[PDB]
Amino acid sequence: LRGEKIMQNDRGDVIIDRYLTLDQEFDRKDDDMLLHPVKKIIDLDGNIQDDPVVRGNRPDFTMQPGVDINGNSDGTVDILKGMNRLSEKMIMALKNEYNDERNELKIDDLNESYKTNYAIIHLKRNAHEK
Amino acid sequence: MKFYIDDLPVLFPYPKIYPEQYNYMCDIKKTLDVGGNSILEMPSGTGKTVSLLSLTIAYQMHYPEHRKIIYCSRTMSEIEKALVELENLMDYRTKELGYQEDFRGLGLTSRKNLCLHPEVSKERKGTVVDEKCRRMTNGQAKRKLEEDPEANVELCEYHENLYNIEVEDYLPKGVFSFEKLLKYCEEKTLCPYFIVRRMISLCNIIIYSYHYLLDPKIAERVSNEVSKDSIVIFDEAHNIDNVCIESLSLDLTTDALRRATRGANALDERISEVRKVDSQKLQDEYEKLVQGLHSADILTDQEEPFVETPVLPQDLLTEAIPGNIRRAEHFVSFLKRLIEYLKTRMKVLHVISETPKSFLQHLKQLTFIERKPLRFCSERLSLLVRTLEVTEVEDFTALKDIATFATLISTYEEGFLLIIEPYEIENAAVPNPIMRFTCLDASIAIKPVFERFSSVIITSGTISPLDMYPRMLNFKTVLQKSYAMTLAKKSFLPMIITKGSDQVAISSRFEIRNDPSIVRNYGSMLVEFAKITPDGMVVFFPSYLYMESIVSMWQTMGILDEVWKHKLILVETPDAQETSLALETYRKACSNGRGAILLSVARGKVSEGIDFDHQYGRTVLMIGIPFQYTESRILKARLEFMRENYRIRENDFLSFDAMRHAAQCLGRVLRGKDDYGVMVLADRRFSRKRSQLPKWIAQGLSDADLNLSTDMAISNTKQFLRTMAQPTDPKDQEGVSVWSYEDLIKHQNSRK
Amino acid sequence: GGYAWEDEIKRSWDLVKVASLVASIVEARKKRTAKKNITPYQRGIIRSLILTLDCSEAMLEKDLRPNRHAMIIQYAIDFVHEFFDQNPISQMGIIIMRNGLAQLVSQVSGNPQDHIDALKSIRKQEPKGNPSLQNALEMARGLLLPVPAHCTREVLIVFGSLSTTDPGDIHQTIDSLVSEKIRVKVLGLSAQVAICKELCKATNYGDESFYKILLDETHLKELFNEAVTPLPVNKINKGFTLVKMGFPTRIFEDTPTFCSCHSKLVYGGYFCPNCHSKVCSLPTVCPCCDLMLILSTHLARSYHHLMPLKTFAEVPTTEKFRSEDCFSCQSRFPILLTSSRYRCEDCKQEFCVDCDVFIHEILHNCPGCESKPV
Ligand code: SF4
Ligand SMILES: [Zn+2]
Ligand SMILES: [Zn+2]
Ligand SMILES: [Zn+2]
Ligand SMILES: [Zn+2]
């Protein structure tokens, strides 16, 4: 839960460990809920798929997740995804029940400077005598 | 504001303009009038897309030539950003001009990003989308349905609707971004992909990625629609050479060859079955082959070749098919023994690198195959697949890779190297041999581009030295310069950290990655900058594997625990969609005041296109020089080829490659001139590479800040952030860092 | 690879080797330039200000000696005194962000003593936890609800941290504040924050000058003093209205009597002109007929804001001088480069530098203008 890498099977706990499969199922459900269409400006899936037929040289192992001698995943990617899930859970929980991109792209520094619109009053200094 | 150049007016969409933007526009106009290529380097902080778009559009809308514009970009995200700028520019022009001009603008992209069919669009693979989309629109299904309505073959209503309406009336006149284009198409029930592709001729400006102009697989069809005299613009071209090198490359594994035999066996079985029921289908195609007709003549416009031409169009032979592969069965035998030969070469127990000529000679000696039949392997296979009319091509997809290999290796002879290495992953119990057909010459793929288009504008925020690209990529430049940014106050504070708090040198060398001293110093550095950074902090690692090891070590050390107190931690992951969600969360945390830190790779996907401006980027931390894996056969072969041909030292190129990827990350912090951010280059080796940075970044770098420690950098950062938050006197930047209309006119008069 | 020892000796003594009056004048002129522009902007005399102070781990930093918590609390006491001296009718409230929650420390009222005492108690409290802008703003939003409509709602957040932990979407609160016409002023301590900038800009009708981050200990006092003066209102916003009020008369009694406000024995007080109930002190809302009792002096203090005295312009040296001595204080102008004479435009009478500052800071009427007979 806290993102610590799962070392070789330790003592752990007989009873709590039985809930690991349920916890994994909950994480998969949470990941599905979090997944949603992303704004095309920052979308990265399209960038890699913009050329579906490209079959260039495969990148070296430095650009791929670490793997063990047997070929199984090292396990570092699992904890990294946990960090993303935890952050997404926190941010999504904030938004409880209780053209936009266009404006952001425009460079504001070149726009007209903000001008104050404070009211002005000129009171008449003519009051009746006692 | 309407301001004039030597002989034309320009409608800038803002009341005031930067001094750099005016100079940038003037130089672009000079290049266009004189002609020829030019390499411009404008600062990333100053607006560049708006300035470039404004001038080029005015140039075509005023001069009699009415030349078209081709605007290339690294990724799709850049296309949308440029499209939004273009539409904003058009709106301003229409308002000032009163009447909306006869102007059209679209952007090419793959089927996946534009598909609207509920079933096909759900596919997770771009190629799978193409297979399904083609099946519903190849024209075979429509003809079969017309012949027999009882046929159950489906169609695509979006594609069919386009037939009713004319091509010139697919969309209303104007600029159509991806979001706007999708909305209109959904309402009208039309396919954006076909509308965009079919309207290339009508468009005045076309925006598409480099892969649509340098990759022959998806460039030969598009290149026929664009006009020869159009203006070509390369935006963010500092990484173009990688695209050129990666376009004519290919990798074959043991699994690929195994599936090739399965596909060939299936192909032979299908041919026999087709022969039994009716052999007239094959006879008609054979007669056409003898006549000399190629795929282009045989295949109709609606249909597409099964295997895209892997080699450049100019290198394709024009003579007739050799004859050894004319018959359906003879070609299958030709394909089969070629696959077996590749399987034999996979058994090598040591690395073997050889030229294509040697590979062909050995191939011929063992199994009798000549150069010429191989060159037609891709073309012949497409015809055979079309003749067989196979409904499903799931098995035959493997044969596509083999066909590509044959044409590539049988067409080019200089600048390509074939490397077979028994160990693809050295840390593997069982070898997994892989043979790589790598391209060493980056100028082969871009040679047609420069020969075709007279004027090319190569511009990028971080592109230096400007003299390397003309050497690495063979072309001549009429003009080339870099613009310094006239800024009232120091908007960015670059620093080169070389030591930790304990005065111990720190470096990201991959062989000492698991060093407690180096790991801890980076960990402490990340925490300290997270404490003083208000909203956004981006960390770029040299490689993904390095990022994983460091993060795992930090978790055990508990350094990440201290980070969690101040900022949410988002990490880039191999999955593309998950990374997009991470960026969404990272942006949200920065905007709402929670604060977040993004851990990503310098040479990853996030660095190419995603701009971390204003609150998003307030500090950028570069954890080491993003060097390439030195012990790589592909890199070593390219370096040797480059040294012998273009006379570039191996060390010089490696520093050039590393610095370009560090510079691009640094330049994503600034969007305008009011934006401020602190750039950190945390590595010992960065100290002596200051001169290799972009000129505008170097100017902001100071001698005192050339070799700093963590304590000094943090103290320096605290003062800088405090100062930059204070209001700036308008008189300071009234007419030096920003120009009004009066200031621009005064400057123009002074020049004359 | 020789070290720095072998190169040379530093020779520190080599570094050292062997117009002010005009500089002061030009410096004053540059400073006076900002004061040259002044117009009688309409300002809301009656106001209700909710003072939010950050009491979190960020306050333990020693940037401001002895610590941020001590200096903020101490200057808050001075701000409370100054705020209620310039604006007598206004009411104020105090909130503090601590342990991730907004804690109320003094109800919104018009008694400076209550707010001063509340701040004094907070002195010993040790800041801890993270700040929460949304919790403070939501609490501030509730506090400013009972306040009358004619009053101008105001929030003055003293933010010291760089990150905010909220339980909900703070953007909703910002929209809600704009709906309730609440203007937020934020005094940052370390660096700019995206959410703080948005909150100030959105609530101040797009003005970005209401979010300020100090640069040293001295600048903090100037920022605190600036918030004392009332803020101008926009043209579009309309709040014109009349407020019922009365002026009670001080009553002297031989025998002490019970006070309606506190139910305590006090020798003297002010009798209300409506219900005749006695109130210990002014200016406060009457405890019985809830009409704000005030003296004529309380209204007088705010007149100078409505009609500020026009700034004086230094006379050119070439032009002749009206007299050799200051009109008001009769101090000879030093002979000296540039004449140090300032004349009021309306009455055209020279003044000295001491009078120029005095006649525009403490004394709010030009002596010459009153002397001139119309
Ligand atoms: S025609 Fe367009 S909508 Fe239909 S499947 Fe192909 S890409 Fe998708
Ligand atoms: Zn009382
Ligand atoms: Zn009363
Ligand atoms: Zn005087
Ligand atoms: Zn006067």
Side-chain angles (χ1 to χ4, degrees):
Chain A
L1 287 167
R2 75 186 309 284
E4 188 171 319
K5 188 173 278 188
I6 184 167
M7 197 53 206
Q8 292 177 335
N9 271 5
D10 210 353
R11 289 285 299 100
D13 179 24
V14 176
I15 294 168
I16 293 281
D17 280 331
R18 293 182 183 174
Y19 294 93
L20 192 149
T21 184
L22 199 71
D23 190 14
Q24 186 173 355
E25 179 50 60
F26 268 106
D27 285 326
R28 183 174 69 80
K29 179 165 56 50
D30 290 345
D31 289 332
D32 186 76
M33 178 171 173
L34 294 169
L35 179 52
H36 70 79
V38 175
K39 290 196 288 180
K40 183 62 65 67
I41 290 280
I42 58 170
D43 188 312
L44 311 178
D45 189 58
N47 302 332
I48 58 161
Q49 289 290 352
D50 210 4
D51 185 348
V53 73
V54 70
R55 41 183 169 267
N57 297 126
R58 296 134 72 91
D60 290 344
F61 77 104
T62 53
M63 314 304 313
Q64 301 197 337
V67 288
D68 289 345
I69 292 283
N70 297 318
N72 292 320
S73 292
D74 189 3
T76 306
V77 74
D78 199 77
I79 59 164
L80 296 183
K81 292 182 186 292
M83 293 176 204
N84 279 346
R85 221 177 295 129
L86 191 74
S87 81
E88 277 151 33
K89 267 191 195 185
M90 287 195 233
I91 206 73
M92 183 177 72
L94 291 191
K95 276 185 183 177
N96 56 18
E97 305 302 284
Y98 177 79
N99 192 0
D100 290 344
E101 61 89 20
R102 174 154 297 181
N103 303 117
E104 173 54 27
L105 180 59
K106 284 170 73 68
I107 174 163
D108 208 339
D109 185 16
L110 303 182
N111 259 320
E112 189 77 345
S113 309
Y114 174 82
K115 185 189 183 69
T116 44
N117 206 15
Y118 303 132
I120 53 175
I121 55 159
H122 51 81
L123 60 92
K124 310 165 200 173
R125 196 199 297 162
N126 51 3
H128 199 240
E129 186 174 2
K130 297 179 73 68
Chain B
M1 78 202 197
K2 284 173 69 174
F3 74 89
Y4 278 76
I5 315 296
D6 277 14
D7 58 356
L8 65 84
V10 189
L11 279 77
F12 203 68
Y14 297 109
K16 44 183 88 74
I17 197 181
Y18 290 140
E20 292 84 52
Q21 292 175 332
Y22 177 76
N23 290 315
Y24 185 59
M25 279 188 242
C26 288
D27 273 324
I28 285 162
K29 168 153 160 49
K30 290 164 166 129
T31 286
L32 289 172
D33 279 7
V34 74
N37 311 323
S38 88
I39 313 177
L40 305 183
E41 179 179 16
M42 202 163 149
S44 183
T46 62
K48 188 195 87 203
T49 304
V50 65
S51 297
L52 183 150
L53 279 181
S54 311
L55 175 63
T56 48
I57 300 293
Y59 191 98
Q60 72 168 345
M61 293 301 259
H62 182 214
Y63 283 105
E65 303 286 9
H66 288 300
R67 311 174 59 188
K68 316 298 211 291
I69 294 159
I70 291 164
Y71 186 96
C72 308
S73 58
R74 288 191 73 178
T75 46
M76 177 193 67
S77 61
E78 291 284 326
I79 297 169
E80 188 64 10
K81 276 194 179 103
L83 272 157
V84 169
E85 288 279 330
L86 183 66
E87 195 163 359
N88 185 216
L89 172 66
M90 286 310 105
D91 283 333
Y92 180 83
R93 276 177 69 77
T94 295
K95 184 181 70 62
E96 295 299 319
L97 297 173
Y99 68 95
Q100 157 158 300
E101 301 164 289
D102 180 1
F103 182 84
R104 298 177 156 290
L106 307 169
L108 312 192
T109 174
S110 79
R111 282 191 173 87
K112 201 176 104 147
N113 305 320
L114 294 173
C115 183
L116 293 171
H117 196 277
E119 302 306 287
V120 180
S121 73
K122 275 191 285 178
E123 298 289 346
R124 299 285 295 173
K125 276 81 174 175
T127 311
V128 175
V129 165
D130 304 331
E131 302 221 323
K132 288 215 160 74
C133 166
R134 287 204 218 89
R135 271 186 58 72
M136 278 196 263
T137 75
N138 209 2
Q140 280 278 124
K142 199 160 144 167
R143 265 205 323 279
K144 290 172 67 174
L145 187 68
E146 290 175 350
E147 288 291 330
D148 286 344
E150 190 61 271
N152 53 6
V153 72
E154 295 181 354
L155 295 170
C156 186
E157 59 189 0
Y158 294 77
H159 175 255
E160 279 296 272
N161 287 24
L162 294 169
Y163 272 69
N164 303 320
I165 53 168
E166 290 82 1
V167 65
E168 289 86 7
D169 286 330
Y170 281 168
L171 299 157
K173 297 258 182 170
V175 171
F176 265 106
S177 64
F178 285 159
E179 194 190 34
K180 191 174 180 181
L181 180 83
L182 279 161
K183 202 161 277 189
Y184 180 97
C185 288
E186 168 50 62
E187 282 168 359
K188 268 70 180 178
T189 314
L190 313 165
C191 178
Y193 178 85
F194 276 94
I195 287 170
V196 163
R197 277 224 74 197
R198 288 173 188 176
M199 284 178 68
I200 289 163
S201 75
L202 312 171
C203 280
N204 294 92
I205 180 165
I206 189 75
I207 306 154
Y208 52 70
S209 58
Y210 288 131
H211 292 85
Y212 270 65
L213 183 142
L214 296 157
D215 183 8
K217 291 179 218 83
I218 51 168
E220 72 176 359
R221 311 185 297 265
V222 173
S223 163
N224 289 336
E225 304 293 331
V226 302
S227 66
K228 178 170 78 70
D229 293 351
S230 64
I231 306 166
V232 180
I233 295 160
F234 294 165
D235 187 1
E236 314 200 320
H238 60 275
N239 271 116
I240 194 161
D241 69 304
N242 287 340
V243 185
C244 305
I245 287 279
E246 198 256 353
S247 299
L248 304 160
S249 309
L250 181 70
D251 276 359
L252 271 165
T253 59
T254 303
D255 190 0
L257 302 175
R258 180 172 294 104
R259 298 180 186 285
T261 57
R262 182 182 293 176
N265 274 322
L267 208 72
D268 198 32
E269 161 166 22
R270 174 53 170 275
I271 293 152
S272 178
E273 292 172 347
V274 165
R275 184 76 77 184
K276 289 179 175 72
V277 293
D278 54 357
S279 65
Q280 186 65 256
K281 196 80 194 318
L282 318 187
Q283 194 66 240
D284 198 359
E285 198 260 329
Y286 175 89
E287 183 73 34
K288 291 193 287 292
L289 289 179
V290 172
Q291 288 290 111
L293 275 69
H294 282 143
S295 192
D297 281 11
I298 295 163
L299 268 59
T300 60
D301 53 51
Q302 188 177 357
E303 298 177 351
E304 288 158 33
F306 180 61
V307 186
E308 297 85 351
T309 59
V311 290
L312 266 165
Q314 67 204 34
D315 298 307
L316 271 169
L317 290 190
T318 80
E319 56 180 285
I321 307 301
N324 304 297
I325 55 175
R326 270 178 189 175
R327 296 291 185 191
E329 293 83 356
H330 298 173
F331 174 69
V332 160
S333 65
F334 174 91
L335 212 60
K336 282 176 86 68
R337 56 199 212 255
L338 174 63
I339 288 156
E340 300 321 310
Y341 175 70
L342 292 190
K343 296 216 278 187
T344 293
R345 301 283 273 152
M346 280 287 207
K347 292 130 81 178
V348 300
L349 295 173
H350 51 89
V351 160
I352 296 169
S353 70
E354 63 185 1
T355 75
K357 195 185 304 315
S358 304
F359 181 93
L360 289 175
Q361 189 169 6
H362 200 237
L363 166 71
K364 155 167 191 143
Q365 186 162 3
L366 186 64
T367 184
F368 290 81
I369 287 166
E370 286 72 356
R371 203 159 164 273
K372 185 161 71 72
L374 292 169
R375 287 173 99 166
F376 287 104
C377 184
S378 64
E379 190 275 333
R380 177 49 185 149
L381 178 55
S382 295
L383 270 293
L384 192 66
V385 167
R386 183 189 171 247
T387 49
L388 297 180
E389 290 184 352
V390 302
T391 184
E392 63 92 20
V393 299
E394 296 296 329
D395 289 345
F396 299 171
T397 188
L399 278 178
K400 207 138 62 182
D401 188 0
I402 293 291
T404 296
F405 182 73
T407 315
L408 286 171
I409 203 159
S410 58
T411 288
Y412 303 117
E413 66 283 5
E414 289 282 288
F416 297 78
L417 198 67
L418 184 144
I419 296 159
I420 320 182
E421 52 194 4
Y423 298 81
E424 184 182 16
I425 316 301
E426 51 173 20
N427 185 91
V430 296
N432 187 351
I434 179 173
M435 74 178 58
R436 312 168 173 277
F437 190 73
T438 68
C439 185
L440 311 182
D441 212 8
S443 61
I444 292 166
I446 201 163
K447 190 67 63 169
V449 175
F450 286 122
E451 184 178 3
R452 185 176 171 81
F453 310 102
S454 66
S455 85
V456 188
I457 293 287
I458 314 184
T459 178
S460 160
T462 81
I463 180 168
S464 75
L466 273 75
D467 290 345
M468 186 81 74
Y469 292 87
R471 264 194 304 163
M472 194 211 308
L473 292 67
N474 186 216
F475 65 87
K476 295 172 72 172
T477 60
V478 175
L479 170 69
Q480 86 192 16
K481 60 155 74 149
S482 60
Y483 307 87
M485 60 197 305
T486 309
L487 75 175
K489 58 191 179 294
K490 182 173 73 176
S491 63
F492 51 107
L493 170 78
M495 309 182 282
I496 295 171
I497 280 167
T498 60
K499 310 178 287 185
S501 281
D502 52 357
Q503 300 280 344
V504 183
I506 59 172
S507 181
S508 83
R509 288 194 296 169
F510 185 64
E511 64 269 18
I512 60 184
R513 56 174 151 142
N514 285 305
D515 173 19
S517 175
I518 297 169
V519 169
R520 188 168 295 288
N521 281 344
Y522 281 158
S524 190
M525 184 189 307
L526 187 153
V527 176
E528 282 296 322
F529 273 103
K531 288 174 83 71
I532 71 181
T533 311
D535 274 319
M537 168 154 176
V538 179
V539 194
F540 284 112
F541 288 92
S543 46
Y544 191 89
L545 181 57
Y546 195 90
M547 184 172 79
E548 275 187 348
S549 190
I550 297 298
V551 167
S552 302
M553 278 284 212
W554 286 346
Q555 192 69 80
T556 299
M557 289 177 196
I559 303 179
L560 289 190
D561 297 331
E562 192 175 4
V563 178
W564 271 115
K565 309 193 152 80
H566 302 294
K567 301 195 178 304
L568 300 182
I569 306 188
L570 279 298
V571 183
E572 184 203 308
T573 42
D575 189 359
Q577 280 197 341
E578 285 175 72
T579 305
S580 299
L581 273 296
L583 264 176
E584 273 277 348
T585 299
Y586 163 88
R587 279 168 179 261
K588 274 178 186 176
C590 287
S591 305
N592 67 3
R594 179 63 182 270
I597 186 167
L598 189 81
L599 308 176
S600 52
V601 189
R603 313 174 71 102
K605 76 189 71 53
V606 170
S607 65
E608 50 168 357
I610 298 299
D611 60 333
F612 296 94
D613 74 316
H614 279 85
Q615 61 255 26
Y616 308 140
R618 279 295 191 253
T619 185
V620 159
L621 192 61
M622 190 63 60
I623 300 304
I625 287 171
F627 273 122
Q628 210 165 355
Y629 183 34
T630 315
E631 296 298 298
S632 170
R633 321 308 283 163
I634 304 94
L635 181 69
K636 260 182 180 72
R638 193 188 167 191
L639 291 171
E640 196 79 346
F641 173 91
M642 195 175 290
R643 191 189 50 71
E644 278 291 328
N645 296 57
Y646 305 141
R647 295 286 293 171
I648 297 163
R649 300 196 256 288
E650 305 168 23
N651 289 24
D652 273 331
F653 179 87
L654 293 168
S655 74
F656 171 69
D657 198 344
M659 290 305 292
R660 93 176 82 172
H661 281 91
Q664 73 180 359
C665 291
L666 288 198
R668 295 281 144 67
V669 165
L670 306 164
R671 179 184 295 289
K673 277 208 193 153
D674 79 324
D675 196 349
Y676 61 86
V678 60
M679 310 160 171
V680 190
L681 296 160
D683 186 11
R684 174 188 53 185
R685 284 164 292 167
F686 265 124
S687 52
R688 300 295 300 279
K689 291 203 183 302
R690 165 208 187 191
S691 170
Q692 306 186 358
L693 282 161
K695 208 186 70 155
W696 65 274
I697 299 176
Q699 187 171 355
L701 193 41
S702 282
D703 310 275
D705 299 334
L706 204 75
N707 54 346
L708 281 172
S709 167
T710 295
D711 50 355
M712 294 197 287
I714 290 298
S715 70
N716 217 344
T717 294
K718 264 200 199 75
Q719 190 65 80
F720 170 86
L721 284 165
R722 168 185 323 291
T723 286
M724 289 308 286
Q726 310 297 308
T728 316
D729 290 345
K731 304 295 187 289
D732 199 312
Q733 62 178 2
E734 185 65 13
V736 289
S737 177
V738 185
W739 285 356
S740 74
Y741 184 81
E742 282 70 355
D743 306 328
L744 172 52
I745 296 285
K746 178 151 55 49
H747 168 66
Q748 269 195 353
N749 273 271
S750 77
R751 296 178 71 245
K752 266 146 79 167
Chain C
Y3 301 93
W5 298 294
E6 304 179 350
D7 296 338
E8 286 193 353
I9 283 162
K10 300 175 179 181
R11 288 188 183 174
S12 64
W13 68 86
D14 287 347
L15 294 171
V16 173
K17 292 179 177 180
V18 175
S20 83
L21 299 161
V22 60
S24 87
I25 291 285
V26 300
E27 282 298 281
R29 289 179 185 173
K30 291 286 286 190
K31 294 153 159 40
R32 291 258 170 203
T33 310
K35 307 202 282 172
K36 280 195 195 114
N37 50 359
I38 200 80
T39 193
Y41 286 135
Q42 167 186 311
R43 295 176 184 270
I45 301 308
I46 300 168
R47 46 194 296 201
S48 178
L49 190 148
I50 310 310
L51 186 68
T52 296
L53 304 185
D54 178 12
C55 286
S56 292
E57 193 171 2
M59 296 296 97
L60 290 178
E61 280 190 353
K62 309 289 181 73
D63 290 345
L64 282 64
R65 307 314 201 74
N67 56 352
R68 273 158 168 184
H69 186 232
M71 188 175 285
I72 290 301
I73 295 288
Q74 183 57 41
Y75 275 114
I77 300 282
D78 190 1
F79 163 74
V80 171
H81 282 93
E82 291 170 352
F83 173 67
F84 272 94
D85 271 323
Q86 300 296 332
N87 304 317
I89 299 167
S90 315
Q91 52 271 68
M92 184 169 68
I94 312 295
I95 303 165
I96 61 176
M97 305 177 294
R98 201 166 96 86
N99 280 110
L101 296 174
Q103 201 211 47
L104 180 73
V105 300
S106 73
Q107 295 292 350
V108 61
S109 78
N111 188 0
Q113 199 64 39
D114 298 8
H115 309 316
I116 295 154
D117 295 21
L119 282 167
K120 290 290 287 297
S121 296
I122 289 159
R123 277 194 194 278
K124 63 98 181 176
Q125 200 177 188
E126 183 178 2
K128 73 195 289 186
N130 297 311
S132 178
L133 280 189
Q134 187 174 5
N135 277 348
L137 290 172
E138 291 292 347
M139 178 167 288
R141 185 168 175 273
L143 281 181
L144 290 165
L145 215 57
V147 70
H150 70 267
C151 298
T152 64
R153 296 94 170 282
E154 275 171 346
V155 173
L156 167 52
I157 291 163
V158 168
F159 199 77
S161 185
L162 295 154
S163 166
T164 297
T165 52
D166 308 297
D169 55 344
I170 191 154
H171 289 257
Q172 189 73 258
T173 297
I174 295 161
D175 196 312
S176 310
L177 286 175
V178 170
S179 173
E180 293 292 329
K181 297 174 164 69
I182 295 165
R183 314 181 65 186
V184 189
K185 200 179 162 87
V186 176
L187 307 193
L189 286 178
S190 58
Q192 216 162 42
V193 187
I195 188 60
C196 288
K197 180 177 203 95
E198 198 203 3
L199 167 66
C200 295
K201 187 186 142 293
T203 53
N204 284 276
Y205 309 105
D207 191 3
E208 289 157 10
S209 57
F210 287 97
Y211 183 23
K212 295 178 180 179
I213 297 87
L214 76 167
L215 61 89
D216 63 352
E217 160 165 357
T218 59
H219 192 213
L220 193 143
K221 174 50 156 68
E222 294 177 350
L223 289 183
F224 269 93
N225 198 1
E226 206 279 343
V228 166
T229 70
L231 274 60
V233 303
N234 192 344
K235 293 179 179 179
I236 51 169
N237 197 309
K238 73 201 205 70
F240 307 164
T241 184
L242 282 76
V243 303
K244 185 170 182 173
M245 272 209 284
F247 308 152
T249 78
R250 182 180 182 172
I251 189 70
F252 300 96
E253 271 156 309
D254 307 295
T255 316
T257 56
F258 286 100
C259 68
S260 173
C261 64
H262 316 112
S263 296
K264 295 179 183 296
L265 280 296
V266 285
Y267 277 116
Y270 292 66
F271 278 169
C272 181
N274 222 42
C275 62
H276 288 215
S277 64
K278 91 183 273 179
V279 304
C280 284
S281 62
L282 270 65
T284 68
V285 298
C286 184
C288 292
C289 65
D290 74 9
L291 68 88
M292 181 144 58
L293 310 164
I294 55 160
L295 306 179
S296 87
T297 75
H298 295 148
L299 304 193
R301 174 76 82 160
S302 293
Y303 267 129
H304 73 79
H305 283 130
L306 306 184
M307 184 176 282
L309 200 71
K310 292 180 179 179
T311 186
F312 296 174
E314 70 280 5
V315 307
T317 185
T318 308
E319 287 181 349
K320 306 207 84 202
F321 324 125
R322 286 282 299 99
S323 174
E324 297 287 329
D325 50 41
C326 195
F327 178 77
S328 69
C329 73
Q330 272 193 351
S331 179
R332 294 182 67 182
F333 310 98
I335 298 295
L336 181 64
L337 197 147
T338 46
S339 80
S340 49
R341 288 173 175 85
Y342 314 136
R343 66 163 64 94
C344 171
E345 293 181 354
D346 311 328
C347 58
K348 293 181 180 181
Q349 285 188 357
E350 278 68 354
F351 289 121
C352 72
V353 66
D354 290 333
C355 280
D356 198 356
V357 168
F358 181 71
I359 294 167
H360 297 249
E361 285 186 355
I362 314 308
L363 187 78
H364 290 298
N365 51 355
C366 171
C369 291
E370 312 310 326
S371 308
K372 184 189 281 290
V374 175

